Amino acid sequence: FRNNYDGDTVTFSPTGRLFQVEYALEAIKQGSVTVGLRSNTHAVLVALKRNADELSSYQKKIIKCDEHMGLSLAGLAPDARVLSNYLRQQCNYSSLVFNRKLAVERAGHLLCDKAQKNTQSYGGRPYGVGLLIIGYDKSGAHLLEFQPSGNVTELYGTAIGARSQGAKTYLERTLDTFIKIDGNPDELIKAGVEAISQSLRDESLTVDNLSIAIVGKDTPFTIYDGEAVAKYI
Amino acid sequence: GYDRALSIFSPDGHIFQVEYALEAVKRGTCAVGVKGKNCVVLGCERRSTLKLQDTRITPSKVSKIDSHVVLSFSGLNADSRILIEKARVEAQSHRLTLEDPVTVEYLTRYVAGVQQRYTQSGGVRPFGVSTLIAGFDPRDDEPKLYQTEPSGIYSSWSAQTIGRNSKTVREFLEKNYDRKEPPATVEECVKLTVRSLLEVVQTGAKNIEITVVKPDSDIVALSSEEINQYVTQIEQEKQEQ
Amino acid sequence: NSVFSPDGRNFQVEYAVKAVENGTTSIGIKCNDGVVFAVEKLITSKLLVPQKNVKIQVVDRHIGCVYSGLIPDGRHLVNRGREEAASFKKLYKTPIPIPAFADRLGQYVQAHTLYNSVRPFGVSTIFGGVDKNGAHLYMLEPSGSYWGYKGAATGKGRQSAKAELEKLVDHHPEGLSAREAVKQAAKIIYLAHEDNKEKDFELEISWCSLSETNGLHKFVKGDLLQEAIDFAQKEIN
Amino acid sequence: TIFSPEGRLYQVEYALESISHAGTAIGIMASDGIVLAAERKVTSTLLEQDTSTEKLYKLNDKIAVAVAGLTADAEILINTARIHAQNYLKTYNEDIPVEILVRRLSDIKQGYTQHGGLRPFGVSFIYAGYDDRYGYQLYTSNPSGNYTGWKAISVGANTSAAQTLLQMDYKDDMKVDDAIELALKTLSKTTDSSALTYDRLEFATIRKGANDGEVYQKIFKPQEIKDILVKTGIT
Amino acid sequence: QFNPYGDNGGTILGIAGEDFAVLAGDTRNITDYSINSRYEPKVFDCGDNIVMSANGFAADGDALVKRFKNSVKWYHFDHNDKKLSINSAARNIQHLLYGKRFFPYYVHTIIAGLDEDGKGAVYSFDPVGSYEREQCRAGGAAASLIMPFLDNQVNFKNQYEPGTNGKVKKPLKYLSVEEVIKLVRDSFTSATERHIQVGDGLEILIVTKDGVRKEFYELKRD
Amino acid sequence: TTTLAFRFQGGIIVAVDSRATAGNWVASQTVKKVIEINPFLLGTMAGGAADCQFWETWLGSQCRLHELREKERISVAAASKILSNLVYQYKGAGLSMGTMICGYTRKEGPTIYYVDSDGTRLKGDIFCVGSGQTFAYGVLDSNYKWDLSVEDALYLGKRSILAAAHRDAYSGGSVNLYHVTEDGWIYHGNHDVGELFWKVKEEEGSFNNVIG
Amino acid sequence: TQQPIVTGTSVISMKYDNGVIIAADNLGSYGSLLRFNGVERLIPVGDNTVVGISGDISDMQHIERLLKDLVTENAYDNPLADAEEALEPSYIFEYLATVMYQRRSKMNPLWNAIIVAGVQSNGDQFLRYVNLLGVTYSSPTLATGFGAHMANPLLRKVVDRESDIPKTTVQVAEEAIVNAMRVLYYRDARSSRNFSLAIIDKNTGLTFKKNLQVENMKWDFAKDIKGYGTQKI
Amino acid sequence: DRGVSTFSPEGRLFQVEYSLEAIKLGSTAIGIATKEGVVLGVEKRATSPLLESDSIEKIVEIDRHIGCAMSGLTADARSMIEHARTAAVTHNLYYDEDINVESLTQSVCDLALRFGEGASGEERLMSRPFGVALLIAGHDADDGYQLFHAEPSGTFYRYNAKAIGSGSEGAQAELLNEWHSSLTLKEAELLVLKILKQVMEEKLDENNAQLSCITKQDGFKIYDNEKTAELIKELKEKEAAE
Ligand SMILES: Cc1ccsc1CNC(=O)[C@H](CCc1ccccc1)NC(=O)[C@@H](NC(=O)c1ccc(OCc2ccccc2)cc1)[C@@H](C)O
Ligand SMILES: [Mg+2]
Numbered sequence A: 001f002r003n004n005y006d007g008d009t010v011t012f013s014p015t016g017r018l019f020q021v022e023y024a025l026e027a028i029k030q031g032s033v034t035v036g037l038r039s040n041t042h043a044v045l046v047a048l049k050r051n052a053d054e055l056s057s058y059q060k061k062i063i064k065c066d067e068h069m070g071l072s073l074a075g076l077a078p079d080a081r082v083l084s085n086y087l088r089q090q091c092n093y094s095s096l097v098f099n100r101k102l103a104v105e106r107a108g109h110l111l112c113d114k115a116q117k118n119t120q121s122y123g124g125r126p127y128g129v130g131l132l133i134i135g136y137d138k139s140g141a142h143l144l145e146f147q148p149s150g151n152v153t154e155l156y157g158t159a160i161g162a163r164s165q166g167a168k169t170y171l172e173r174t175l176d177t178f179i180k181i182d183g184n185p186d187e188l189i190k191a192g193v194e195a196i197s198q199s200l201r202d203e204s205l206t207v208d209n210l211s212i213a214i215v216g217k218d219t220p221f222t223i224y225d226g227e228a229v230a231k232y233i
Numbered sequence B: 001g002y003d004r005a006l007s008i009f010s011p012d013g014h015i016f017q018v019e020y021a022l023e024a025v026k027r028g029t030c031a032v033g034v035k036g037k038n039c040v041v042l043g044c045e046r047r048s049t050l051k052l053q054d055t056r057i058t059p060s061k062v063s064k065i066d067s068h069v070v071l072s073f074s075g076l077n078a079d080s081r082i083l084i085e086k087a088r089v090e091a092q093s094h095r096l097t098l099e100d101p102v103t104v105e106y107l108t109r110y111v112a113g114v115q116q117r118y119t120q121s122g123g124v125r126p127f128g129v130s131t132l133i134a135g136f137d138p139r140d141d142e143p144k145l146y147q148t149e150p151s152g153i154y155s156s157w158s159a160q161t162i163g164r165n166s167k168t169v170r171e172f173l174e175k176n177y178d179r180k181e182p183p184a185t186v187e188e189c190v191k192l193t194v195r196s197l198l199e200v201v202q203t204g205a206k207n208i209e210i211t212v213v214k215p216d217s218d219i220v221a222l223s224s225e226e227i228n229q230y231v232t233q234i235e236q237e238k239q240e241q
Numbered sequence C: 001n002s003v004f005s006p007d008g009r010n011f012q013v014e015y016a017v018k019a020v021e022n023g024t025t026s027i028g029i030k031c032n033d034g035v036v037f038a039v040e041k042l043i044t045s046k047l048l049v050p051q052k053n054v055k056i057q058v059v060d061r062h063i064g065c066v067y068s069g070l071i072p073d074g075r076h077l078v079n080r081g082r083e084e085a086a087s088f089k090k091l092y093k094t095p096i097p098i099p100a101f102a103d104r105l106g107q108y109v110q111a112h113t114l115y116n117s118v119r120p121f122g123v124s125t126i127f128g129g130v131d132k133n134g135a136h137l138y139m140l141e142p143s144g145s146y147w148g149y150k151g152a153a154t155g156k157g158r159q160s161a162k163a164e165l166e167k168l169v170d171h172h173p174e175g176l177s178a179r180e181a182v183k184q185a186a187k188i189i190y191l192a193h194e195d196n197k198e199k200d201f202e203l204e205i206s207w208c209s210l211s212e213t214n215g216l217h218k219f220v221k222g223d224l225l226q227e228a229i230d231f232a233q234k235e236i237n
Numbered sequence D: 001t002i003f004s005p006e007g008r009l010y011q012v013e014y015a016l017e018s019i020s021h022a023g024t025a026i027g028i029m030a031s032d033g034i035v036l037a038a039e040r041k042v043t044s045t046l047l048e049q050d051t052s053t054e055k056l057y058k059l060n061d062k063i064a065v066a067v068a069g070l071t072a073d074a075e076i077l078i079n080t081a082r083i084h085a086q087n088y089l090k091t092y093n094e095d096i097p098v099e100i101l102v103r104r105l106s107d108i109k110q111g112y113t114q115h116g117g118l119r120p121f122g123v124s125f126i127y128a129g130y131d132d133r134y135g136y137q138l139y140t141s142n143p144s145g146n147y148t149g150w151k152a153i154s155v156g157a158n159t160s161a162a163q164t165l166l167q168m169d170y171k172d173d174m175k176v177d178d179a180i181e182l183a184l185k186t187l188s189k190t191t192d193s194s195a196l197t198y199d200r201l202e203f204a205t206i207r208k209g210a211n212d213g214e215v216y217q218k219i220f221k222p223q224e225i226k227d228i229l230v231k232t233g234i235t
Numbered sequence E: 001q002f003n004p005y006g007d008n009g010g011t012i013l014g015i016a017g018e019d020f021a022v023l024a025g026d027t028r029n030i031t032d033y034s035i036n037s038r039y040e041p042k043v044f045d046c047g048d049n050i051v052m053s054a055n056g057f058a059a060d061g062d063a064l065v066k067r068f069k070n071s072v073k074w075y076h077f078d079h080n081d082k083k084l085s086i087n088s089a090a091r092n093i094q095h096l097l098y099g100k101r102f103f104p105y106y107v108h109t110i111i112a113g114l115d116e117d118g119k120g121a122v123y124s125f126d127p128v129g130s131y132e133r134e135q136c137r138a139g140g141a142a143a144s145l146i147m148p149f150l151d152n153q154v155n156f157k158n159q160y161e162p163g164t165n166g167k168v169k170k171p172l173k174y175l176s177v178e179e180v181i182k183l184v185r186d187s188f189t190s191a192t193e194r195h196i197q198v199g200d201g202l203e204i205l206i207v208t209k210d211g212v213r214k215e216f217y218e219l220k221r222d
Numbered sequence F: 001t002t003t004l005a006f007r008f009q010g011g012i013i014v015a016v017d018s019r020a021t022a023g024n025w026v027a028s029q030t031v032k033k034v035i036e037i038n039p040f041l042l043g044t045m046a047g048g049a050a051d052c053q054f055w056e057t058w059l060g061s062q063c064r065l066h067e068l069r070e071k072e073r074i075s076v077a078a079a080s081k082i083l084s085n086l087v088y089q090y091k092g093a094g095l096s097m098g099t100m101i102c103g104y105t106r107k108e109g110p111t112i113y114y115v116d117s118d119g120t121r122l123k124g125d126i127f128c129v130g131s132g133q134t135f136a137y138g139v140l141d142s143n144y145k146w147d148l149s150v151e152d153a154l155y156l157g158k159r160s161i162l163a164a165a166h167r168d169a170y171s172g173g174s175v176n177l178y179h180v181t182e183d184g185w186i187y188h189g190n191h192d193v194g195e196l197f198w199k200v201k202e203e204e205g206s207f208n209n210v211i212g
Numbered sequence G: 001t002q003q004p005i006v007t008g009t010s011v012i013s014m015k016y017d018n019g020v021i022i023a024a025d026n027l028g029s030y031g032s033l034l035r036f037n038g039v040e041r042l043i044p045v046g047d048n049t050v051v052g053i054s055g056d057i058s059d060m061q062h063i064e065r066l067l068k069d070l071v072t073e074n075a076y077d078n079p080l081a082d083a084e085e086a087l088e089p090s091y092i093f094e095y096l097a098t099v100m101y102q103r104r105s106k107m108n109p110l111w112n113a114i115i116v117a118g119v120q121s122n123g124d125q126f127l128r129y130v131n132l133l134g135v136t137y138s139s140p141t142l143a144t145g146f147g148a149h150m151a152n153p154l155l156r157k158v159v160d161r162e163s164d165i166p167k168t169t170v171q172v173a174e175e176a177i178v179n180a181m182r183v184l185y186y187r188d189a190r191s192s193r194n195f196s197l198a199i200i201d202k203n204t205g206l207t208f209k210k211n212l213q214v215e216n217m218k219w220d221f222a223k224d225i226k227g228y229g230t231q232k233i
Numbered sequence H: 001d002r003g004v005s006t007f008s009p010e011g012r013l014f015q016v017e018y019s020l021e022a023i024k025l026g027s028t029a030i031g032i033a034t035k036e037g038v039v040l041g042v043e044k045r046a047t048s049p050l051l052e053s054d055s056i057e058k059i060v061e062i063d064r065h066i067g068c069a070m071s072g073l074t075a076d077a078r079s080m081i082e083h084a085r086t087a088a089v090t091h092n093l094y095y096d097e098d099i100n101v102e103s104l105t106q107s108v109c110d111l112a113l114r115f116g117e118g119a120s121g122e123e124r125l126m127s128r129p130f131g132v133a134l135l136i137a138g139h140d141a142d143d144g145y146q147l148f149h150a151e152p153s154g155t156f157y158r159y160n161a162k163a164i165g166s167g168s169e170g171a172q173a174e175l176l177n178e179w180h181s182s183l184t185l186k187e188a189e190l191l192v193l194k195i196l197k198q199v200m201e202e203k204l205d206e207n208n209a210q211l212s213c214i215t216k217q218d219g220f221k222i223y224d225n226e227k228t229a230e231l232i233k234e235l236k237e238k239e240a241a242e
């Protein structure tokens, strides 16, 4: 049942389960929390950065993919680099060949298909990273959740990582209010920073803790770190 | 076709295959290198098991890589041949492109690099060989001696030994080698090299072989009659109180 | 995978079926000139955007695909189906007939049960559309097995769906319209939801009818979707 | 291909184990020739003696091998060795020096020892050759890919016994006729059979070519072995 | 036979001021004796305060510009949003061009911006990647017509001090952006009068510490 | 193009013109025909501008790599052979360069290697390369002496380019000058042929073929 | 290396106040043999775009299939295929221009001259040209082959610069096209009487006219022309 | 024993974890970043008194503005330095500038990822992760002096100070106290030299320990034996007076 059935990504368990993929999912829960949510005009990523030491830098959780698209990571960081690189390329291909900004939904489909091939190949391993992808395209604001299983779902809001269940219950509660925060970036960011709070056995979140990203109608995807997030604590 | 990984990490942090490659070196015949003021000497032991050999034609342990650099080894004899050949090719290639023979450090860095590469490639096993590389850089009188091991680590040694009972001869060399007073001549450097083997060989007849390297491509092998004279003089001189 | 048991079975394929059984329930209904596909979408949370996690996929212009099991595997199968359909049209000019397309998927899925280096697909796929000589509905198991169907269901609610599907074949032996079968698809999905009641669900319907869609695959939306939802809600009580 | 915690190559040691059961082969090197003698593995009356060679193979005009182990494996290696000699001849217009041919083969064996995850060749060789640099030469190689030079040597069964007997009676100034005698004596004493008869032997010499200045390979015909088995006094 | 090359005419001109640079080009695109467009820009803002023109065979010109703009994008992605300095851009373009040394982009390419110390800068490239920093450079069809004018009116060459018996030179003073623009407009009207491929419109891109400014002037349409 | 390099008593002199042409069109008068590979290594450029610029810059990278790998400056012989062997790989593909690799190292002394795109590589004391090579050669050979002072040798280099800038239609602009010693290379200035010619005629009493 | 076999002649086009007009005759020539008499060289893509192709007809039929394969592909996993994620004229153009350029660069061109005409989602007129060399340009008027030499001068008398575009009515522009077609029929030996014409209007949509003919032809004056100089009867 | 890139039930890559253990077995390396430079120091650890200590290369130059110290299976670091050096030189060839320290580190961490076979995506030419960690230190115009810690996991952190190797636990908590943003280069030289003396098995001298720095002005320099000696003298006298 669990014994001879988690050797590789190419074996089914007698229950119908793929254990390597479920173990890769467990690398996410181990990772530092991050939150994403959107109104009609903007989409926001908020991430708690983690330092491995008091003398070290807090490691980055937000990667930019195009002028209209970016993601936050939770899990194995090098994997996020691999997946964002591919995503940057797909965005690039779409611009150069078709002169078209890649739809956020297609970006989802593309990440899903890439993740899938690593759940069926021998001698490979699944990706061990979860991703939250935000974008503004020709149909407005979008937020996606990516799981290394290949499952990609479009949501109004979500959170992934350690203790993430707090923020997710909060957003599920705050739904009707934040969806309507249109034409106000700073209020939506406030609603996201306040959301990541429900996921803290940790402490106060400082000016190094904290990492925020925004994209929307007339805002290219931008990253705010350090000094520039002070006004939200 | 076959790239299945053989060399991997152990829970306590070692690479098991490398570590066993060293075990093969441990059981290989002893080799020793000591450097004089203006020379480097290389000695090796020969086993007793079979003694009906042909010494004219059997590959000796000290090999010329170029006309100024030599290589001795301990471990799997067959594995060593692959390293020596590659090293010889690299030497000719370095002369071709840089228009100058290799330094002894370069040649060591090259051999150690090949050794390392076999610890991290799929479907290959590491070399069961450790090496002593000795010689003189072109247009230089300052003597060189280096040692490599299956891992790919290398470094220089005033004197060193590898193979079975290398512990005993290293212990002998640590006592009898003075850095401020290194063996002043070829003759007195060869004598120290033989003394160190005599701790392990227990005989010394055609069981000890000695190669001497000097500045500017002067590399001579010693004959039985020339080694005998050293062996005889050592036990006779050192006996009384 | 490439391992036969002593009694001639393939345990890995049998286990792959368990992954299918575990999944959402999806159905397909064959009507007198087209086909209807419907699927149950479990609403995990209010945070999921309604109407915006489309499960039903189009292949070429005239084929619809729905699947239950590991969703990513289904997408992998549809990508392949699309390559296989493009290739066919490139050489033969005509769009791929449905039986022709079924076999293309069939051989591909079977291939994934021949080699120790691969796992079988963790899906069952219901698919079909309108070609040169009528409407066709298929279902394809993880073993590569497939046959034609009058009606087909897979996933968690497969048994009650089959029971309802068996009843329709008995009451309408002479046909059954596209407009009717769309309604009926809404009903059967609602009934099959009984098993997954702990969470809310969203209904997705699509059809490919010769007279209603001009033999092209189209999503059921707006007034037609609402009317079918009503029928299902009204006939559940 | 992997190492043991001892620093041994499992598959090689097991290949060598396989060899110790193969019929003994003996090489003796004299000043004016070389002897190759080998024992065929317990056969049958119906085996065609005349058209059979399971242990002694010609490599070129001046080099030969005695085989101990898997014959089919040996034929693979012999064939490539035969080619290597012809490549050398084409390149230099000189017959390949014996050691170069031995080293080459030994390297192909060393290869299977170090990569590719294929079983080593279950073969041991005794090489008998002449060239104008080292004169008469005798070499041995085994599945590890190590090779060594010898004045007398054996491979296959009872090498322990055969080597002690050769060490006892071998002397550096031997003629070929004395080396023929030793080789047969040694086999007879180490056999696991009632008597060493012609039908169970393969025999070859590399002499100084009757009367010339050239080198001649004599592979003994079945009848010639029966003759030399009487001459030496074993009938 | 199939000839992979063509020639779309046009002329471009780049002058480096003290704290500014201009890159100008006519907006006419031609094939043999026909006009294709009267307004088809060939000077582009590439981000990071660099302007670029690749004049000659338009398909090769656009392909290069497209590919460099892309190089700028990926520079950001790989080097933590660092500004691509003019000199680094110049070197980068050399590799793009030389990359096709055995099937060249058939363009004379010019870039313009501000250097590290905020001085005006102009770089010009041959088809296969040879490049140099220059005070000013005209390229394309009417290059042979305009360059000597610029040698005379920008670097004051052969102009001596009146009455010094031709020994003291006209001091090489710096030009204002108004004085540069004047020389550009005049260079292009002269070029339009005497070259059949030059005409229709003039588009100038001006680069200061404040960004990229655009200016347009009608030209004779014959 | 005219470029020269010669060895003498007190090192190496390197001198080049600065004219670039496309057909009969003078493309540039301010072109830099020397690459400063490092504090101890210079390379000269004749033939295709791009070919030289691109491959001699690459050479500099390859030399930097040698220093990091070997913890010692690359020998002139080796730096030259790198560029030489690269060029050879491209033989017959159309590469067009005439090049001198000049420098001082402890082991070699001051050394000049001539390297062209045919693959030829020559060690020598005097070389002129380019369309104006013969003109430079005419002055250089007739006034050369091993024992020449540093001041004099620099002039002979400068004067030889001028000779060639005068006669060869494809040489001109300015002379760029370099001195290479035990301690490395020192720039000896840009010299516009505009001014230089009249100065040299005046002070030296040469160039009587010239009216006024 | 290659050479055109069955060919089509000019494609002619202009912008007017609300959209674009494009026309091309229905002939496929085989050298100087007027071989095929019902060839359609206007390609509707979606219904905001018409692609007009001249040059080699086999390569034309290739591009046709590519364009159809592009509609299929855009519809895949795209719920907004007939809405905001429909194929735009610019998307179709950039794709073709990429293909054209890659093919010439591989020394194996699609032997064509293509004009992509249509209306953008925001209402903007789109009119651009690409050919076998990958050369691209845009203008108030565009034409290929002979059309370049004879249609452009007449069409430019109507729309001479940008500012002329809002001053030009559907009727005026269509008339100018229809007249240019007649002129081409008079003087192009590789032309036909029968032609298709398409109007892409930001209000009307796509109007596609088949089986048009050149009307009101002047030939009467020919009766008075005698000999080649001196002949009177 | 099954595979090389298999996940544990916890969600960790087996082989990556054990390589981290291999690094703990290695010699101590310490890096301290100030506003006047970065200091890199290592424990030579000769395995015998006949080993010529100065042939132990554990601090290497990458470019004029980037140097690094290593700890673990140090042979595994050869090709990492080759790649680093090439990336720096190449970057300069393409861009006529210095490679940013952060960019050089990321490049080195990409190389570290290439264990596998191809891993349904690209290609992987290596059978196991590297068994060595690196302290990459340097200067660039954007972020000044920097210290990174490159791990075989493919992650890298920036540190004000950091220690790796066998002494690394005790050395790190020691750095936790002594480091402040006002540190001079001379102070930082002393701190590395002091903290090494603490954790080393042997008595620290100019033979079994090595110092180096990188400053914007003079580039990356490995201090020679005469110079470190004088800084050891100065350490003794400073602490004997305390
Ligand atoms: C050595 C050096 C270094 C810096 S300046 C210089 C002196 N060289 C020069 O002045 C040479 C002299 C002419 C020449 C000789 C030999 C080979 C090629 C060209 N000039 C040059 O190299 C000049 N370039 C050119 O003359 C040039 C001409 C055509 C061309 O490719 C066009 C093409 C043709 C067919 C198909 C596709 C593309 C590339 C470069 C450059 C300065 O603009
Ligand atoms: Mg079922």
Ligand SMILES: [Mg+2]
Residues within 6 Å of the ligand: E084, E085, E087, E088, H096, H097
């Ligand atoms: Mg820069």
Ligand SMILES: [Mg+2]
Residues within 6 Å of the ligand: E191, E192, E193, E194, E195, E196, E197, E198, E199, E222
């Ligand atoms: Mg004109």
Ligand SMILES: [Mg+2]
Residues within 6 Å of the ligand: F164, F165, F166, F167, F168, F169, F170, F171, F172
């Ligand atoms: Mg001249």
